[model samples]
Target: KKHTGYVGLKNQGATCYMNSLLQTLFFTNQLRKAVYMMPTEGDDSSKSVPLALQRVFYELQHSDKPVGTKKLTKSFGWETLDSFMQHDVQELCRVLLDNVENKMKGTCVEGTIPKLFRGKMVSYIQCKEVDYRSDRREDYYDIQLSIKGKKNIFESFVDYVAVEQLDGDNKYDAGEHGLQEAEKGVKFLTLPPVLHLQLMRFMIKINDRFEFPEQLPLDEFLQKTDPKDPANYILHAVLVHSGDNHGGHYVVYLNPKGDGKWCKFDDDVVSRCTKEEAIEHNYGGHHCTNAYMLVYIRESKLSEVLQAVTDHDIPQQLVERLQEEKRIEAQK
Candidate 1:
């Protein structure tokens, strides 16, 4: 109530969803560093997404009052930006990161975005009785878990890796081995350092308890046999959606430190919150606010991922320019 040690965003009408995602990105230590490390030299704000994002993040950290997203949105060519309706936070995140990832190309931190959030999994179809198999390895930025019938996250995880029978009408065409009965399933070869879990509550849902843990492990979901280091992930942030007739409102609760302390970022008002309020309350089923997305960081990478961002991490010129711009605005 008194102090949250952090500033918040000033919503541009029904923009809480965007604000929530922005704050989550700001708190994501590696992404924050990468955003700062981005090169915006001689690039104007209108054409540069990372620069605009970097400005918003810098302001969120140092400003006393709420920060604005006008420039960032403008950079997205959104001046004609419609009614500011409740847009999907997941979409915004992907679009924003897509732009940033492009901007980071050929730069020092070129692979920062991928390194922080990219995960690998193998979807395979194996023969039932013959030595024939087909697999596709792909990258994923997030995992969407079903909420309709899931008792917990694990239930969804098991279902996610559940084997599917590909026989009879769905027999596999194993090139040289001819048509054969097969088993199809996907397995995790590796999970990212920073993982995002999107609950399949979108386009739907307004209750029905969804249980998740503060500390989670994807060991059971991995496609590997030997486990030197577990794919254990600690809860980092929870993005919640509160239902309303006029779309909905979004808020994100965060655990940004080793102590696992929590805070709520509800638009311009930042406040300290208890673990239950942060985790348990948003578990779904009794209220409008339901956990929509969950962000988790790997246990082994926690130290580096959550480390403090020093001033040097940010470019000196950008700060001076933004501050000078702010000063001129005050007199205008």
Candidate 2:
């Protein structure tokens, strides 16, 4: 049974894009445990997003066939027709997480998502010669890197944290210092344990191979932070977009066990795949297939992030809810 027993998700037409993202998030053991630990006992399953989400994840874990998501979408307040229309996968992910995070407020699992996904970023302007500087801080859940001429994912980092030189023509106005040469750009103050990368390509369906490695060390892109160690990450999922300009399809290659054993979760069908097939095939060499979103878990927390899902770890109500639902479905 250990030989790839994981179940897939049933697609609601164009909803595979969303399904792909959910699968990755579900496989994120920490987030999954947090969602399950949410107190959804008194709440109605169909209306609550986290409760509905718990059903999908729980079923995906215990079932053989693909899990359905009609209830989950409905919980999001999306109409039946909405599934056919393609929405931005990242945006959908944010909306869902926002709802779930809001629901968890004032509860035992209040800051779980933030703890796992939130990263701090700072945009600043520093005078090259003077001590005057200005800094603006913000938060980010994922990083979007354009895949235009870049041959690899690491190159995108250079562009992301690249310093802008405001010199001869464009100088900084430092009030007292007047017009002076200054450096302006963004830098990472902190990166999350669960880091997500959205591979951006303005021109869709390009047969350009953009490579990404399994292991990534992001120390090159970040500035001095509160943490003692560098930010190191390991690839957990590669969400690929497959199709032409007008329309596209979505599929995700997930390393569920936190190791080399990868699986392709393509809308109701799940299959075992090798390291090359999972990483190389989706590199955009051929048409209709390119890596879009990548999920990376911090190397230090790999064991904790991919830890086992125990009966005791899950909520009692959710267990009773799914089992009772199945009991009535077949018992009658």
Candidate 3:
């Protein structure tokens, strides 16, 4: 069924830019207030909610390709600014309250809360297990460098570090899922400056700190054992220990030769999610559950990846649909 209410001036209008701006402002304010109101106990100070908001803004601004306005609107839970102004904030608050209460249910629970992500609710949630082996992110625009385009894709993991950790006093320590500090001994790939900045911003957006293990300098990471072959050094990932609130784990393997068999990270992670998890995380048959992302690089060779995408056969219906999509984008 469609949404119950029609667009109205009292609520943010779907098309009104002014309403969109105001709605963003108002929601931002609510997020800020939520930080102070949220209960924090045995919680890493770095994961505070306010920082998460800042992170979202940073990533959205620096994205390699512009994320569509339609996407942004849906993400923020506003069909239009008018909906926010008129629809009432209490319903949103109720969800946040539920999250806090549910969080208190003890981290010992086996899996994620099933109904927590049903509809018109907070998008954030604790995530779980590592799934994909090799995955390529499709978004390549606006990024400084890409793994596929570069000649050499293998290098030392320790070469580049996540230099930017947001500023704040450490309320507590103990790795906290690398919440406050990057792992002292483990060095992964080195990311470009822009990528690092964007990652930092995204960290803030997702629960206020970097709990997930996002290693950088993706190109030339974990020096290849065979110097001539870059594919020897695949992106390795560690499970994000959520102290019982598990948020999930993932790894990216970049095959220098563009092996069609290697699974891509963003595309393959969702298969591991349960139906219950899927409904809560908004996978929507798109990708993983409870995850929103922007990938920086893509393989240029159509033969390998495209073949896999089409399962090695080009269906006429798909061809027609793809052409239509391209035409629509061109008109824009």
Candidate 4:
């Protein structure tokens, strides 16, 4: 009874957007644990986002009946909306994170979600005239990278936003902003436990397709780190978008429990898949299937973290239901 057959989300018309995000969120170890362990004493129990998420995840893990995310969607203030129209996945993610923060407000659990994905980066600018180096630090939950050449994931990340330029058409007006001619770039000061990489491929059409990596070496992207102790990450999930911008289907390739195995979740259908099949998400040159979001976790802590997930107590109702379901099956 410990293991249940794969669960699928029933389609509510455009719920594929929600379904794909939910699959990735459920596969996320820290997010799953946080949702599972949330205290359920609040007044907004029926409308609580995290609470709804907890129930949805529990059902996904243990329920025999088909699961729908209507309650979860309602918790995020989309209850009255028609289910036929598509919603932006990124916008959904943003609102969901905001809801999580709201639920944690004035509680001991404040900042729980932020701590998991918060990372720091420094934008540095070196003045050409004075050699004066100025930098600004910022915290981010997602790293937005521009898709450059038809190279690997890391190579595409080798991009920097220019600031304080003194030449060319887009040159900085020195007197207006009190700036100087400078070489500018950004670098990571710290990396989060779970890294969310959003490929900025919305407006632009690209011909270059790069193979997604099994293991991502993130140390090369860091601003300061020991050469010997490089930070390594293994891909856990990918969100893929198929078709054109006008209308498309969203699907997810998730690696369950750092097992190096993969599965495709295509809204109400779950199937075993190869890692190579998952890598096919690297879309390019009018390819309909393209990688939208990449999810990775630190390689060193992968096993320990996944093991911690198994230690959480499953809900008693889930246990009872599974037992009853199995009994009936045997009787039949």
Off by over 4 Å in 1: 78-87, 127-131, 167-181, 225-228, 244-246
What TM-score against the true fold does each predicted structure earn?
A: 0.91, 0.89, 0.21, 0.82
The 10 consecutive residues of candidate 3 with the worst lDDT sum are 118-127
Q: Which stretches in model 3 have alpha-carbon errors above 4 Å?
A: 1-77, 82-186, 189-219, 223-302, 306-332
lDDT of 2 by residue, 1-332 (tens): 43467777886655757888888888888888888877788888688887898888888878877788888888876665655354566778887898888878988889888898899999999999998999899999888887787889888888888889998879888899989999998988888999888888634446578999988888767777346666878889998877765567778999887877898988878888899888988887746678888988888888888888876887776788889988887888
- lDDT tens digits, residue span 102-124, model 4: 66667666786787678988887
Tell me the spans in candidate 2 whose CA falls farther than 4 Å from its real position.
1-3, 80-86, 127-132, 165-183, 202-207, 225-228
RMSD of 4: 4.9
Compared with the true structure, model 3 gives a TM-score of: 0.21
Q: Is candidate 1 or candidate 3 better by TM-score?
A: 1
Error in Å for residue 16 of model 2: 3.4
**Compared with the true structure, what per-residue lDDT tens digits does model 3 show for residues 1-332?**
22211111122133322222222222222222322232333333234332223223332322333223332344345564356434322233333334443543544331122222111111111212212122222221112112222122121122222222322363113233433322222223222111111121121223222211222234343322233323221111111111112223322222212231222222112112222321222212223222222221122211321222211222334334434544777899
| Deviation from native of the Cα of residue 149 in model 2, angstroms | 1.8
Query: How does residue 308 of candidate 2 score in lDDT?
Result: 87
Model 1 residue 218 CA deviation (Å) reads: 1.4
Clash totals for all candidate models = 1, 0, 33, 0
The lDDT of model 3 is 0.26
Clashing pairs in 2: none
Of candidate 1, the 10-residue stretch with the lowest lDDT total is 78-87
